[PDB]
Every structure is written in structure tokens, then in C-alpha cells.
């Protein structure tokens, strides 16, 4: 569970460039032989994506921020990639979304999973039938409070090692929209030596996950290898095959989706990438003719918000009222009308010079930003036991017989020793 790998070594987060990856269908709506403009979380073209690989002395399983969404791309031969772990803390403290392909079917579960140092899945002791069927479940130790579960169709996953170039390409898109998770999938063969192929691809929805949880980080699972001949310490002596996976970031950009006759996307344009792409977006066409065109309007954003209000001097003597030499009796409470001046409540409410303070209907902070019509101050002295009677809808010797506050009283009560 928590046993760290012997040969694992940390590496700096190297970056690599993508050609046109990050294009997917925003929804299930079908369109063909048209150029549609839409804005949604997209991976900008020619952007930088993390460069990670898995080998026998560098094993990559870092924790990456999820933000609003991320993009996945990896080149595989034996399909080393196993799955992913999604969640805020990736621990039982909250719910975490997980996707695992354990050689039988894609399993999606949302529960409170126990965090592990290096979660993953693997197989052992194949001998004379490759199998490669899930043997150990290190993804999490225990689960509870399961609010969602899904199962896909059964299939056999081929984890057997192969030589030559990378014959497989898998690219997934992960995003969150008001708690609604959308997963897109694409699978095409390739012949690649390193990095990523130069081309275009379109990703399609895989599953619908209306879960509704906050996810800020995620992990990438990898599949290791084991054998009767070269085992290791449990479980630090296990090794994995050669594979490379890349992780991107999605941003709210607008793309021009060019739809063919069959509806498949054959080209895409990123407005924020190239001013030529900006011209294409403005013209809503994938071809730009020679000439000069107006695309948008530049503007200089303000550096900061500057507020210069007039002097708040000529304040009415609230301090004198609170510290006056004498106060009127509770039955003879004086009704003081205050107007034609400014009120500075910062020195009153925030000075912590009074034992107790409370407001009815409006919080003290909001009152500082509000302009009133009429303000009245009622000053009186009562015993300690009678202080609790000063409130809307109260009764007693003071509330009923001396001074009564209406149930709709929107003022505040101030008292001190």
C-alpha cells in the first residue's frame, strides 16, 4: 500500500509542444459541412504539456492540479497506463472519483478512498498464458459512502510487451462544468519514435458522470511488471514497462470546429493562438483571403481601482453621546435625532471597546456601506439582568413597561460595563 518503489526517482517537469490536440465535441449536437464557433474549456494549440515517462530508474506518478480541467495524451505499446485518481485531497476526507481499467472492464466509483503513497495496479507470474489480469488492488485500502458506481462492457486488455515503435495512441479529456464531469476518448494507431505525432484528431464522449464534487488534483496510474524470475521487496522491487504520457491544461478558449460531410472534425482554429486565427474567428471561415481586416478592438485595462471620496469630517459627536456625563432614565429614555453630518462607524464597531454588540436585520459590516434616511439614538441605563430584555419581541419590566423594540427593528444594540 504505502511501500515506496526502490528505483523511483524524481525528475523535473519537462514540457513539450502539441500541434492541434485539445479538440472535442462540446455536446451531442450533430453538425456537418459547416464551420461552428463555440467557447468552452479547451487546451490551447501549440501549448506546453508536461513530459513524463515510465521506465525501470524514473517512475512518474506525480500529483497535478486539476483546475477547471486537463487534457491527456500518451503513446503506448503494451498499454502501461492503467487509470487515474481524481479528488480534492485524494483521501477519505472527501469523495474522490476514480477510473481504473483492470483488464476486464472500466470501473468508475465515487467513494471515500484511503490515500496511498504510490497507488497502482499490476499483475504477476504470467507463465504460459499471458493473461495479464488484475492481481493486486493497491489503488486504495478501503472505501465508504459510495454515491455513484458505473460498469462498462467487458473486454480483454493486452498488456503483453511489444518491440518496435509505439503502435498505439490514447488521448482523453477531463473537465468539470458546474459539478458535471465529462470524459472524452479517442484511440488511433500511430508509428512514433518519440514525443507526439504531428496531426489532428477528434475525441468523442465515453461516459456521463453527473457526480458533483470538487476536484483540485489528480494522479496518473501506471501498470508494472512481475515475474517468477526477478521479483523484489513488497512492493518496492516491482518494475513497469516503457511508456510516455502527457498532461495538459484546459482554458476557456473559442475554437472554429470545421465539420465534414459525415460530421467528423477535420480541422480546428484557436482564436488566441495566431492573429491569422483571430481573423478566421472574426470572419467565421477557415480560409483568409489576402487583404486587411478588423478582428477586434484593443484596450488597456486599469492597473488598479482607485477611490477618492470626499472628506468625512464634521462627524456628529457619537463619542460624546456614548461618554456623556449623565444618561436619562430607562422610562425617560431620550430620543436623539441625528442628521446633517457624517458617521464614521469604523472607530465604533471595530474598536472592541464595548462588552457586547449585536445588530438585528442587517450585519454591522453592511451598515458601513449603506446610506440611511433617519437615525435615532436611545440612551438608557438598566441592570445586568435586564440587558437580555433589549431585543425585538421581548417582555419584562423593561421591554414591556419602559422601552419596547418592534419585531421589525432594524437597528443595533450597544452595551458595555
Amino acid at each position, epitope marked *: 500500500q504505502c511501500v515506496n518503489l526502490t528505483t523511483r526517482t524524481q525528475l523535473p517537469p519537462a514540457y513539450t509542444n502539441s500541434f492541434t490536440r485539445g479538440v472535442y465535441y462540446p455536446d451531442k449536437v450533430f453538425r456537418s459541412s459547416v464551420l461552428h464557433s463555440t467557447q468552452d474549456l479547451f487546451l490551447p494549440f501549440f501549448s506546453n504539456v508536461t513530459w513524463f515517462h515510465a521506465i525501470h530508474k524514473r517512475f512518474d506518478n506525480p500529483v497535478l492540479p486539476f483546475n477547471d480541467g486537463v487534457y491527456f495524451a500518451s503513446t503506448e505499446k503494451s498499454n502501461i497506463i492503467r487509470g487515474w485518481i481524481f479528488g480534492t485531497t485524494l483521501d477519505s476526507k472527501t469523495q474522490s472519483l476514480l477510473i481504473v481499467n483492470n483488464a476486464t472492464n472500466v470501473v468508475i466509483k465515487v467513494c471515500e478512498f484511503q490515500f496511498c503513497n504510490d497507488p497502482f495496479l499490476g499483475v504477476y507470474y504470467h*507463465k*504460459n498464458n499471458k493473461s495479464w489480469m488484475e492481481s*493486486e488492488f493497491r489503488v486504495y485500502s478501503s472505501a465508504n459512502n459510495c454515491t455513484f458506481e458505473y460498469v462498462s462492457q467487458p473486454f480483454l486488455m493486452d498488456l503483453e510487451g511489444k518491440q518496435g515503435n509505439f503502435k498505439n495512441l490514447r488521448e482523453f479529456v477531463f473537465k468539470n462544468i458546474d459539478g458535471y464531469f465529462k470524459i472524452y476518448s479517442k484511440h488511433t494507431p500511430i508509428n512514433l519514435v518519440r514525443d507526439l505525432p504531428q496531426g489532428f484528431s477528434a475525441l468523442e464522449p465515453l461516459v456521463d458522470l453527473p457526480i458533483g464534487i470538487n476536484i483540485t488534483r489528480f494522479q496518473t496510474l501506471l501498470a508494472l511488471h*512481475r*515475474s*517468477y524470475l526477478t*521479483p523484489g521487496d*513488497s*512492493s518496492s*522491487g516491482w518494475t513497469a514497462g516503457a511508456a510516455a504520457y502527457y498532461v495538459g491544461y484546459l482554458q476557456p478558449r473559442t475554437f472554429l470546429l470545421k465539420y465534414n460531410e459525415n460530421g467528423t472534425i477535420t480541422d480546428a482554429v484557436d482564436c488566441a493562438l495566431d492573429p491569422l486565427s483571430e481573423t478566421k474567428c472574426t470572419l467565421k471561415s477557415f480560409t483568409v483571403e489576402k487583404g486587411i481586416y478588423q478582428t477586434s478592438n484593443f484596450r488597456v485595462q486599469p492597473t488598479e481601482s482607485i477611490v477618492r471620496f470626499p472628506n468625512i469630517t464634521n462627524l456628529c459627536p457619537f463619542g460624546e453621546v456614548f461618554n456623556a456625563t449623565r444618561f436619562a432614565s430607562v422610562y425617560a429614555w431620550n430620543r436623539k435625532r441625528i442628521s446633517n453630518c457624517v458617521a464614521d462607524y469604523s472607530v465604533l464597531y471595530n474598536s472592541a471597546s464595548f462588552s457586547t454588540f449585536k445588530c438585528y436585520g442587517v450585519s454591522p459590516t453592511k451598515l458601513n456601506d449603506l446610506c440611511f434616511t433617519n437615525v435615532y439614538a436611545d440612551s438608557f441605563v438598566i441592570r445586568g439582568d435586564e440587558v437580555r430584555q433589549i431585543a425585538p419581541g421581548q417582555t419584562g419590566k423593561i421591554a414591556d413597561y419602559n422601552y419596547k423594540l418592534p419585531d421589525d427593528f432594524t437597528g443595533c444594540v450597544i452595551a458595555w460595563n
Partner: antibody
Framework: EVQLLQSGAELVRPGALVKLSCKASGFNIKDYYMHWVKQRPEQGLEWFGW????????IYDPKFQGKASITADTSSNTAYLQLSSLTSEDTAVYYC????????????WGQGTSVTVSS | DVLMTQTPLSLPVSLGDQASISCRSSQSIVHSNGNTYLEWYLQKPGQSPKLLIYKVSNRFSGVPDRFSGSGSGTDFTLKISRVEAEDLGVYYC?????????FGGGTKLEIKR
């Protein structure tokens, strides 16, 4: 020196259950597999199943599939075995093994436990 | 499920003689890498079985050097250089790896007289 300790013997009536413990000493229970075996005077040895304390997955002999469950205690460094719906045919001597380190090159056995199922 | 058979049931050997115990399996246990998957267990009187050889070609640590195995395919043989008085017991064959493990019929050894 690695040693596996088990109860000397157990006696239970038909239809009851017997719980056996295999203590781990001198080795890490988490990182090493555990095994169980059934021995009879006429049939010699009969394999029962294996368990990984770190993982917990268990496989049972088709003869005894659905007849028993295997559990382990990490904190106590002891492997537990449970048999249910016992009958006369279950009379045998049970053994436990482990300390494999994911490798067949190292394994050990305890003195075993004699379990008799009769009224 | 794999069926394992052993022969002979028992064999005598005087002190210093060579003892041969053979095991048969219903399925091939050798794989692409070329190694063999099998273990030999010996249960002395009043004692539980103890490992003797692993992989048929490598001796277990602490075992006397006289114990060694050889063979190929599904037919193997256990060879003891010089049998001593402490070798009394029953020899067993074991199938490992990831599969319902199989046991042998057993082979008893005795000293000639």
C-alpha cells in the same frame, strides 16, 4: 530465524466453525505472502489457499471453494484462518507458510495444528 | 486445476547411495524465459514439511549441498548425492506461480539393512 506458530490442536462438532492463527515472527507480515495446507494420512497433503496480507486477495482449492475464508491481521503479525460448515471429512492437520518476498526461493512451515471434527 | 503424480511410492537407499524421486504434471510448467517453477518439500518424522529445492536448479539456503534437482518438461527427478540418516521423511512436489497450487502423492525414503 523465521518461525511460524499455531495452536496445538482444535476440537469442534460438525456444523460448527474453527478459527486458526498463524503467528509471524522475524519477518514482515505485510510484505510476504501467506499460504495454507491440509494434510491427511491417506491423501497426504491437500492444498487449501493463499492470501496476501497487504492485498487481501485469496484463491481457494476448487475442492474447498466457498467452504472457508482467509483473513490476516497486520498489527498483530498473525494470519487467521476460518472454516465453516465443518463435517467429518474436514478432520486433518493444517499448516501455514509465508516469507516469500514475492519469490519462491524462501518459504517456511510451522509445526501445524491437528483439527478433529466429530461429535 | 493441475493433477500431479509421483513414482515410486517409496524406495530404500543405504547410507551413501543415491536416491531418485520423480514427479509428473498434467500441464507444462516451463515458460518462455526458460526457468522451471517447482519446489521440493521434505517432512521428517515429528516435523512439518521443509523446502529443499526451488526452481529445480537452485538450492534453498541452509539446505545440505547433497540435495539437487534436474529435469525438463513435465518429468523431473530429485537427486541426492549421499543420503544420510537425517533424510528420513516424505518427499513432495509443489507447483507455484499464480495458479491453484498442486501437491504430489508423496515419496517415502528408508535406509537399507
Amino acid at each position: 530465524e523465521v518461525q511460524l506458530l499455531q495452536s496445538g490442536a482444535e476440537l469442534v462438532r460438525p456444523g460448527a466453525l474453527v478459527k486458526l492463527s498463524c503467528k509471524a515472527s522475524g519477518f514482515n507480515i505485510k510484505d510476504y505472502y501467506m499460504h495454507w495446507v491440509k494434510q491427511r494420512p491417506e491423501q497426504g497433503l491437500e492444498w487449501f489457499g493463499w492470501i496476501d496480507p497487504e492485498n487481501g486477495n485469496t484463491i481457494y482449492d476448487p475442492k474447498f471453494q466457498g467452504k472457508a475464508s482467509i483473513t490476516a491481521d497486520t498489527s498483530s503479525n498473525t494470519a487467521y484462518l476460518q472454516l465453516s460448515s465443518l463435517t467429518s471429512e474436514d478432520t486433518a492437520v493444517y499448516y501455514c507458510a509465508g516469507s516469500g518476498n514475492y519469490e519462491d526461493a524462501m518459504d517456511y512451515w510451522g509445526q501445524g495444528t491437528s483439527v478433529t471434527v466429530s461429535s | 486445476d493441475v493433477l500431479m503424480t509421483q513414482t515410486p511410492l517409496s524406495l530404500p537407499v543405504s547410507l551413501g547411495d543415491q536416491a531418485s524421486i520423480s514427479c509428473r504434471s498434467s500441464q507444462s510448467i516451463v515458460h518462455s524465459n526458460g526457468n522451471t517453477y517447482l519446489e521440493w518439500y521434505l517432512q521428517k518424522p515429528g516435523q512439518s514439511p521443509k523446502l529443499l529445492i526451488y526452481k529445480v536448479s537452485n538450492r534453498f539456503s541452509g539446505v545440505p549441498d547433497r540435495f539437487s534437482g534436474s529435469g525438463s518438461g513435465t518429468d523431473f527427478t530429485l537427486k541426492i548425492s549421499r543420503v544420510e540418516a537425517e533424510d528420513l521423511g516424505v518427499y513432495y512436489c509443489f507447483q507455484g506461480s499464480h495458479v491453484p497450487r498442486t501437491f504430489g502423492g508423496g515419496t517415502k525414503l528408508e535406509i537399507k539393512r
